[PDB]
Amino acid sequence: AQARKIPLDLPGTRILNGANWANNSATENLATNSGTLIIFDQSTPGQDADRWLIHNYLDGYKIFNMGSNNWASVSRGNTVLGVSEFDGQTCKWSIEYSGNGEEFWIRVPREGGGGAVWTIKPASSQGPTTVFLDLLKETDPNQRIKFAVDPNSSVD
DSSP states (O other): OOTTOOOBTOTTBEEEETTEEEEOOOOSSOOTTOOEEOEEESSOOSTTTTOEEEEEETTEEEEEETTTTEEEEEOGGGBEEEESSOOHHHHOBEEEEOSSTTOEEEEOOOTTSOOOEEEEESTTOSSOBEEEEEOOOTTOGGGOBEEEOOTTSSOO
């Protein structure tokens, strides 16, 4: 294996923060204004709501939930949501290797780098957690993302 490799174009990738994984549900409406929280938890709310697909997008990446058909997006209050409508201005991400183990930061794309990163708090909840953007703290475990690809991740 190679630590630095992102699992691109691998349907059924799971996105983990420690033992919690990212989930996202389909919106009621699918309007330009629609979106649902990305929830880190150890429960999956619906069929393949825990399954993701990462693709190149321009000079970063787009992150797609295969259960909800939503894009991971910044929204109000620096909250990270899934949205049905793709917007290059809100749905593009930098994915940067931490230098440690299998862990990455998912960052706001910024000219000259240093964008805010996915932050999963409350830090010490044993229930569902939401995602917001905060300044990178290099060793903060609440900002460390890993990707899990099972050999049956694409199998349906």
